[PDB]
Design a protein around this ligand. Structure first.
Ligand SMILES: [Mg+2]
Ligand SMILES: [Mg+2]
Ligand SMILES: [Mg+2]
Ligand SMILES: [Mg+2]
Lengths: 494, 499, 50
RNA sequence: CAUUCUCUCAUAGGGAUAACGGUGUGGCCUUCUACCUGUUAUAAUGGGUCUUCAGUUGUAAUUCGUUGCAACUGACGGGGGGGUGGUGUCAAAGCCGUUUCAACCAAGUGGUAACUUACUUUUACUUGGGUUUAUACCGUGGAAAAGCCUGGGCUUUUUUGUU
RNA sequence: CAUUCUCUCAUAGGGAUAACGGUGUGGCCUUCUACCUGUUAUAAUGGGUCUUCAGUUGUAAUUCGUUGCAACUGACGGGGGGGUGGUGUCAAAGCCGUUUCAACCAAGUGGUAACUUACUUUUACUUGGGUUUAUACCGUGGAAAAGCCUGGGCUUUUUUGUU
């Protein structure tokens, strides 16, 4: 029947994708092993290839085995579904402690049961698509969440005094009674077929307690339980956005947020589970940066990888610290770490004004921020000479940053860190007996570093220019006004 | 370059689409002419191949000329857009009298400017798609408008009292100052590129007064002008749905709908123009048989061909009358009209229980009703033998009807009309001198019209069974519950054999 | 005003009128809403006395 | 003025060619597809029957939300006018049955018929997707007659190709 | 147990084969991309420069909605500690300059340091988009050698097909 062929197709595609990912993993490991041997010399460790541990718990977790017997698995699953005796096997569940102090139970289903939950719940979320609230996402890394960060950003700016009330539904989704879920299958004009209903009931029967967390099932079953609360909150006028389990609620009027708080409390009582505000306090006013206190009178809302304010959008502090970590660690790897090893055997020592290690460091920093773009390409796109510009970098995950001062400070930080790292590298090289304090890398003095690096050219193409966040931010602002958030985020779309 | 290539592609696609339609038009006119010659006999009128009138007002309206110079037209248009000296040519405007007081100015642009508008304003409405209200459509026949009718139906079925108010934005879109549009460009986080602003300003300069009523440009500008009204109405808690130059607003509380009236008044004042509610609507309360809250209380609302009540969704009376007219005219044309002519020259007369005209009439009715689906296919889809049943018919335009009584009445009407038409055809045949009363079509007796027709088979296929609305409605209910309104109303998707 | 929900709607009415005229109206210095309560109880606001 | 090709002074113009683009039927291929029965070595062909929903009961499970199977039961083709029998009774209702009239609008209008390349805000769609014989269409180009003019042009028909 | 093929009772099992799937580099096609200048008769190839935003002025259109062109002005690479000078003031804060220290966290900690197959909800991505010489990886297979066992089987390395 068509069902078996559809299963076969989905299972095969999933297995092939995982196999391709593993092959890329091992090839990348080998290439990095070659580079590390050429970098640390004869002190580099050996090449270690690791298979994911859960590939061993059950033979179905292995993509290779699934590709071996995809036909048989599809036939058996189709027969069991049409006999209504299907149950998804136990998912491999790992408990990752949440930073706030909680724990998130991440469940990974087997490839067969992960393919069936991506075929029957990606259709159920299309036919019943218009019956869900506008801002309701599944994982905090989804590409459509950035449409919500825009809305808040557009409101925080316009209504200069916005009341916010962030919430946490983790305990709610974790332990919602299955009967309440099963009572919503025929309301709000949901189109759920008899087969899809059976599959939903099988997946919920496996859990016995509540909705799964990190699965395609999560989004639909979350939009199937909080469909009355959503409608109530819309009817009060307060806007909202649920990322995975958090639920921010914002509106201009105090009364509306006060009523939304009561609506959420009543919904929590109705479901029989407790919903608690994530913020220690309840309502919180996010006013302009300059103003006294009243309820909270805060000026920075976090959301994800952002810090929204009435003035502008900016990168969250933790994300900025991680960017600093990665850049400083790239410099430390390519400049300082090899020299700290007990023996300099098989390491290229800079000489003749050429420092291949410095070139590698700058190139890797560029790939991490720009993605490989040279400044000439970015300027060409900005002027109009170029029709296309590909965005793939750490700045491609923040295509809404309006804060120019933060990028300026971060660029200055990059320059200063490069200068200090080069100074320490020169000191260590001298301590090892190889005195190089008059060459190109070490002649620059923190005010000519950018200029001298820019002038320097390799193979006819500038390969030393110090990367700058501000230029790519200008490019992103231009791109968003020509392609939109969607295209900038997902360049593959054509 | 790129702009030139894109313009070339879009213009050529538009021209080829229009040419394909014209080729099919005269190929369709010829087939119907042949059938007419075999229906009206030797008195049949001669064939006529018309050519759309607006293809002569300007050469650039002609699909057969715009394909000749698509390269040159794209070259010049690109050069003029890069030189900021591009003004779209005058569109052809026709005034269609609205059924109520008023006129609709339908504008048909030239193929080049239509291509440019369909290219630039489809991207502008995609990048800024999340900044527009949920229910906002361009045409009353739009296939995505059923997503709003389902919402109103669900609200009516669930709520206890639903207050509704309908508005008219026809004057709003005909007298809105363009300075307002220009002022509404950089707010609400709209991503309008510099050249996409130039083209908007050029298209608005061409009009000088207001938004073109019908075109790809219409919807984006309608959503761009009425972006504060949508935000305010959303903030109050009253839902809305615009579709074409109209606005329904429904809410559970009278105070909220009154505040919606006040918000529309303020917005109309700000724009400098008037938004008048339809003069026979006020606020309609579709209560659940409860207290009327001292407001005009009705039980049926009319919305884009549907009659929405608190218990069922049915076909509007006007649409039912149109369906009845079409079926009755099919029967009259295929059974009665050929006989009323002054001479029966070269017309096939019933013989040996065979009535080719009756078979043609029943098959045409089946195509209009179902789309050619035989009852066996529909029952196979219902049982489960098959998984595909294309919905191509009049009932494909009403995939939300829950009313079973209306469909039963319509089926009985079809049966009665078929019986009466066959009786009149027999009378006329006798008057002409041919007594076919004994023949098969003229002995059915009405009660056995549906019974004896189903048993009869032609070419080993049941081609006489009288089509029924109820069976296809059952099939549509199952198809909806298994595929969604989008797929039922949009029967191409990717393709068949999609596994 | 006697209700916080009402004075909060006064900042929103001056914020919209300020944008309608196209000029800014800022709260004097950094005073903010001041609750001159009779010591009955506080309501999530800076309770002053003078 | 090829709707073909080509060139350029490129939303316009010039040059070259007679073909360019589509339609119905049939065939082929790929689609999933209950049950019976004719003609044959198991294939084609012909014919025939079924497919739905609601409720109850029984029955095996269930995470008590619900599901599976069986047995049935019920539903599953409008309205109007003129007659007309029965049934109803403060008396009338009311109900049911029977007969007759119609193309629909018309369960209507002061009054009624016509119409589909039509009519109407939008009243919008057509056989499940690709190939391959015969039929044939729009506008073109030729060829032969036919009537207007001139003494080549214009005009009609047919034919040819497109095929 | 090839991640290859194939069969079946089919989410498990059976049989057969040595090959299956990927990576970096270059090449071949695509892809629009300014200006000058080396290098051989307009081609290749070496080198160099420029591209941004805001505001003002002039000027052109002008739908008064704006736009175009030209000129000019301004912005266009962090923070901290120690030392030091100038400027401020009733003294000071304050401002400007200069020198030195620190790989980042660190604008910190009691205290520093280390780490990228790492860390962490969600830390995510790697050069628009297609082919194919030489290099080479995942798990397989086969040989040789080398250790164990037996008296071939097992283990290790190299090599080979893969390629
Ligand atoms: Mg909704
Ligand atoms: Mg919105
Ligand atoms: Mg009548
Ligand atoms: Mg430090």
């Amino acid at each position: 029947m068509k069902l078996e062929q559809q299963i076969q197709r989905v299972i095969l595609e999933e297995a092939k994708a995982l196999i391709k990912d593993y092959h890329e993993y091992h090839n990348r490991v080998h290439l990095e092993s070659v580079r590390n041997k050429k970098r640390l010399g004869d002190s580099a460790p050996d090449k270690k290839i690791h298979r994911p541990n859960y590939w061993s718990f059950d033979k179905k977790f292995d993509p290779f085995y699934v590709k071996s017997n995809y036909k048989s698995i599809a036939r058996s699953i189709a027969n069991k579904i049409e006999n209504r005796t299907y149950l998804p096997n136990e998912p491999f569940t790992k408990d990752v402690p949440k930073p706030d102090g909680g724990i998130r139970k991440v469940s990974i289903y087997q490839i067969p049961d992960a393919a069936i939950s991506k075929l029957f719940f990606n259709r159920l979320l299309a036919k019943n698509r218009h019956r869900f609230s506008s801002f309701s996402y599944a994982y905090r890394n989804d590409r459509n969440v950035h449409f919500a960060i825009q809305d808040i950003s557009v409101d925080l700016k316009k209504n200069e005094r916005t009341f916010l009330a962030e919430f946490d539904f983790s305990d709610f989704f974790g332990s919602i009674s299955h009967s309440f879920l099963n009572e919503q299958f025929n309301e709000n004009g949901f189109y759920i077929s008899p087969e899809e209903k059976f599959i939903i009931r099988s997946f919920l029967r496996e859990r016995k307690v509540g909705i799964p967390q990190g699965t395609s099932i999560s989004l639909f079953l979350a939009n199937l339980t909080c469909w009355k609360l959503d409608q109530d909150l819309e009817r009060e006028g307060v806007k909202f956005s649920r990322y995975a389990d958090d639920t921010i609620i914002w509106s201009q009027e105090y009364s509306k947020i006060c009523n939304a708080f009561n609506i959420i409390t009543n919904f929590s009582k109705s479901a029989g589970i407790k919903i608690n505000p994530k913020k220690s306090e309840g309502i919180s006013l996010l006013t302009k940066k300059g103003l006294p206190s009243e309820i909270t009178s805060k000026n920075n809302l976090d959301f994800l990888g952002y810090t929204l304010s009435v003035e502008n959008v900016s990168i969250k502090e933790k994300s900025v610290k991680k960017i600093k970590k990665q850049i400083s660690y790239i410099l430390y790897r390519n400049l300082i770490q090899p020299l700290k090893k007990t023996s300099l055997a098989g390491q290229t020592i800079p000489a003749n004004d050429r420092d291949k290690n410095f070139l590698i460091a700058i190139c890797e920093i560029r790939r991490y921020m720009y993605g490989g773009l040279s400044k000439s390409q970015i300027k060409d796109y900005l002027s109009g000479r170029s029709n296309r510009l590909y965005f793939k970098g750490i700045m491609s995950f923040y295509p809404l940053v309006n804060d120019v001062e933060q990028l300026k400070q971060l660029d200055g930080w990059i320059v200063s860190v490069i200068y200090r790292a080069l100074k320490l590298r020169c000191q260590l090289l001298s301590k090892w007996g190889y005195n190089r304090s008059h060459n190109f890398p070490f002649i620059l003095d923190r005010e000519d570093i950018v200029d001298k690096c820019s002038k320097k050219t390799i193979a006819g193409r500038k390969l030393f220019e110090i990367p700058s966040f501000l230029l790519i931010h200008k490019a992103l602002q231009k791109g968003l006004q020509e392609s939109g958030i969607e295209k900038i985020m997902n360049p593959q779309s054509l």
